[PDB]
Design a protein around this motif. Structure first.
Motif, mmCIF file in Angstrom:
data_model
loop_
_atom_site.group_PDB
_atom_site.id
_atom_site.type_symbol
_atom_site.label_atom_id
_atom_site.label_comp_id
_atom_site.label_asym_id
_atom_site.label_seq_id
_atom_site.Cartn_x
_atom_site.Cartn_y
_atom_site.Cartn_z
ATOM 1 N N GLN A 35 -4.990 -0.900 3.977
ATOM 2 C CA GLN A 35 -3.806 -1.683 4.312
ATOM 3 C C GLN A 35 -4.170 -3.176 4.550
ATOM 4 N N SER A 36 -5.199 -3.373 5.366
ATOM 5 C CA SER A 36 -5.644 -4.692 5.730
ATOM 6 C C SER A 36 -6.188 -5.443 4.485
ATOM 7 N N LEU A 37 -6.939 -4.745 3.639
ATOM 8 C CA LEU A 37 -7.459 -5.309 2.412
ATOM 9 C C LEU A 37 -6.311 -5.763 1.483
ATOM 10 N N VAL A 38 -5.308 -4.924 1.334
ATOM 11 C CA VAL A 38 -4.096 -5.257 0.568
ATOM 12 C C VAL A 38 -3.403 -6.498 1.106
ATOM 13 N N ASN A 39 -3.299 -6.570 2.426
ATOM 14 C CA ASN A 39 -2.517 -7.619 3.055
ATOM 15 C C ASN A 39 -3.074 -9.019 2.798
ATOM 16 N N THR A 40 -4.411 -9.154 2.806
ATOM 17 C CA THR A 40 -5.024 -10.460 2.554
ATOM 18 C C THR A 40 -5.299 -10.721 1.084
ATOM 19 N N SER A 41 -5.535 -9.688 0.289
ATOM 20 C CA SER A 41 -5.764 -9.871 -1.129
ATOM 21 C C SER A 41 -4.487 -10.095 -1.936
ATOM 22 N N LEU A 100 0.827 -1.192 0.000
ATOM 23 C CA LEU A 100 0.000 0.000 0.000
ATOM 24 C C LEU A 100 0.869 1.252 0.000
ATOM 25 N N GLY A 101 0.699 2.043 -1.057
ATOM 26 C CA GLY A 101 1.158 3.433 -1.083
ATOM 27 C C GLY A 101 -0.003 4.351 -0.905
ATOM 28 N N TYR A 102 0.092 5.215 0.109
ATOM 29 C CA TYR A 102 -1.063 5.992 0.569
ATOM 30 C C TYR A 102 -0.622 7.342 1.058
ATOM 31 N N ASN A 103 -1.173 8.413 0.487
ATOM 32 C CA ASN A 103 -0.746 9.785 0.882
ATOM 33 C C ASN A 103 -1.906 10.706 1.218
ATOM 34 N N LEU A 104 -3.086 10.139 1.492
ATOM 35 C CA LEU A 104 -4.207 10.996 1.865
ATOM 36 C C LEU A 104 -3.876 11.816 3.095
#
Ligand code: MN
Ligand code: MN
Ligand code: MN
Ligand code: MN
Ligand code: MN
Ligand code: MN
Ligand code: MN
Ligand code: MN
Ligand code: MN
Ligand code: MN
Ligand code: MN
Ligand code: MN
Lengths: 185, 185, 185, 185, 185, 185
Positions: A140-146, A116-120
């Motif tokens: 982050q959590s969605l990325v980790n399991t997907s 996850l790259g995230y800059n909000l």
């Protein structure tokens, strides 16, 4: 045959059930105990044309953190299940969506490597009763399991609801793209 | 009839043969004497669905510069040949691709006027035995003979292999878009 | 049945007639009394595949401001008319187009809420006889009557004609996308 | 019964076999085609008292990236397998190790959620023929498949070999701690 | 009678033979054991119309330094020999040569007083296997034995091969000028 | 036999005819519909001893951009044609010319690889009715079709007419040099 992923997961903190159809019609059916998150899950369905069924209960007396996390983990797993062997799909998605003054770019690859790259920069602490730190944690959590490579970039925005909602619109559209059939594959 | 461009070019420094099918299936068949460049040419084929046949030999005892340049020049010419009269195509391409932490935006127009805009900042001097200055030179030379308007923008990235490979993925996808038929033209 | 919007509007300053076909073939037929604006309207038709018919007369002895504004207002209304109930369309558009060294990103949503985000920095005051302040005003006025959410972002550019023309190319392509049928809706 | 995890994984780029005994005696048996990485894997065994068996072959003509990555991914999976149900272990590890002027702190939790925090600043590009960017990638990939929370902090150091080797010593000792039985559990 | 200078010089480190014809046709015949230097010596011949014969062997297992130095020293002496009494020549040379984005100005005087002014900033450490610190040392050593006043000025450039090669082109052309007959002397 | 290149090129925007004699006497015969450009083309002929015949018509009601561009493209092609096999020429040119307080250095190579390095800072927007952004575009377009390496460097200057005119003087003299016979080739 539509690509459907189903996950049931229980912890001491939470109980979660998710069903996602990648080849849906935007059917929205989410109740997490977190109204803002339900609203964002509706956006995911409507803008991605996924059918999204989510039920969750949990320890929201403490805060929304554990429920938010466990919902997102289960969604990530459901997406992975639904994708199956990933044959013939676009794989990559790229979309920039506005919501009034807000403008969010999402680029993703269904790569099997989580990132996850995230800059909000969400300028208020609460949208309704929803802690805005939980937006990053959801992705982050969605990325980790997907096992998704996901970049979320804030190009403009001032209103916190607009920023977060635009993010879900862009994400939904990018994920629709990535999950759709490539006509030359 | 598939759109195929073929170029044979000999110099005192190098001998190069290229064949490209714009309407391919991703057949990758590249051997340049530069292993990293071969790897990137495989990416071009796989991510663009071009069939790419390249053979080169040259003065790699001096460095990889002349071979890299003459490969790229010949690819640019092959693309120009294959495009023919350019009737009915999208012409423009626009894609942002990730590779883990790296994120590269490519926008191009098959305009007939060469221009390269390039802002990559590759933080190491060598990827394997490949001089990372040669990435810009590859794109520049390709632009010059193809007559392409090409912009390459680094949005994120730390690992040099990721940055360069993401660039080739984004370029390939943008070029696929530009070369494909516009259904309303 | 092609989606056609027609507007006739008279003021003390200007007389304007617009007809736009969203489902066109790029037919360009614009005469506003402002040659640069005519040129940009041709770009809109060619790059968007809209058929664009515009006639205007006005008080160009004073300056081009009132004519530019009233043309744009009428185009916005014509687009709104043509869109009708907006059923089954993509709604969103996202395109980044180059013109040589210039590179412009346009993202829009046919939302029914007007908003213009605009960051062009056009380095000369006149392109031909056209006041470059009028570019922003054209888009602003078009947004206001169409009810469009529109973001225009200058990513690169030096030549004022290139910057403005690239903007119209990107806008046209994004608007084509947004107005086209979504195959799953 | 000693806790042993075994992984065989083949890709187009690499072929990898790993066997790890969490309850070992420091038996070191690693041959990856990357001599520096073999040396670091020996350190892992010696300082962690793991038995470590690794074989890999791959496309090192291109660079060491794919082999390094696929070795690390397989090690992460092997560790996950070996851990089984994770009952009765310390779970957490915390160790700061020197190597001459270098000093590296490692803290980890066998949490099931991948995260790498990493701040090494390795002042040279190559240690032998080993690209020092690959150190971070090794740990990242290992985290991703093992589901480990891992923080690596450079407290001091100047010599690149010392910095990297101290990291492996500290990591090994922290992982030994985390994997060992908690006498009160 | 063509002006030819010949030097044989042996050290414990190196064995060098040079023959230069100031009134040549660009005959290039250089083999130093350093491929990049051979390439630059070819440039000297081609762009200066000198005939250049160089043979060297040496301790390249240690690095290229001693061979590079002793080649350059011998070239300087060969040039001095060939020039003889220096009667009737231009004496001064002044040329600015490009190589793509690189632009190098060289001004020299065959003065009998050694001086090197040198401001190249070569942005990579190795061009092929050639240490880019050796470029300055080559010119310095050549100046020292030839008794030349030499100024080398980098006006533009990014690619290290381009910068160095442009330098040799400009130097060759300036030295051709200086060595040629002045028609009024 | 004098080296003459002729080009006729028509677009929707412009109609252009160019004839250039590299071995001319400065015959100036240019009418482009842009008086300042005609004046500069006269300078090219007079200072380069080229014979220059240019006719153009175009959409100058919009601005001078398209005509300026298409004139320059055609001149570049005419120069390429006239040069033929490029045997026996100097190839390189280098000249610094003043015009009162202005001082412009031009260095070029008839290399077959297009590149423009350009740093003019013209302090006014219009010289007569001529948009001073068009100076760079003229040289860029000429480079692109001729395959010339061209560097233009402003060393001094305040008056915009002086700066631009000095540029054409220096360019003309450098191009004369490059195109002339090398007496030793
Ligand atoms: Mn948490
Ligand atoms: Mn809302
Ligand atoms: Mn080159
Ligand atoms: Mn790779
Ligand atoms: Mn107004
Ligand atoms: Mn135009
Ligand atoms: Mn990787
Ligand atoms: Mn060691
Ligand atoms: Mn020395
Ligand atoms: Mn070279
Ligand atoms: Mn132009
Ligand atoms: Mn004048």
């Amino acid at each position: 045959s539509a690509r459907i992923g189903e996950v049931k997961r229980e912890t001491k903190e939470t109980n979660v059930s998710v069903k996602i159809n990648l080849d849906g019609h935007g059917v929205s059916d989410s109740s997490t105990g977190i109204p803002f998150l339900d609203h964002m899950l509706d956006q995911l369905a409507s803008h991605g044309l996924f059918d999204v069924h989510v039920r969750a209960t949990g320890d929201t007396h403490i805060d929304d953190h554990h429920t938010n996390e466990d919902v997102a983990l289960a969604i990530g797993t459901a997406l992975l299940k639904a994708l199956g062997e990933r044959k013939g799909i676009n794989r990559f998605g790229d979309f920039t969506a506005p919501l009034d003054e807000a403008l969010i770019h999402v680029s993703l690859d269904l790569s099997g490597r989580p990132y996850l790259g995230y800059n909000l920069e969400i300028p208020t602490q609460r949208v309704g009763t929803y802690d805005t730190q939980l937006v990053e944690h959801f992705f982050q959590s969605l990325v980790n399991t997907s096992g998704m490579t996901l970049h979320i970039r804030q190009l403009a925005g001032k209103n916190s609801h607009h920023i977060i909602e635009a993010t879900f619109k862009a994400f939904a559209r990018a994920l629709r793209q990535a999950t759709e059939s490539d006509p030359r594959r």
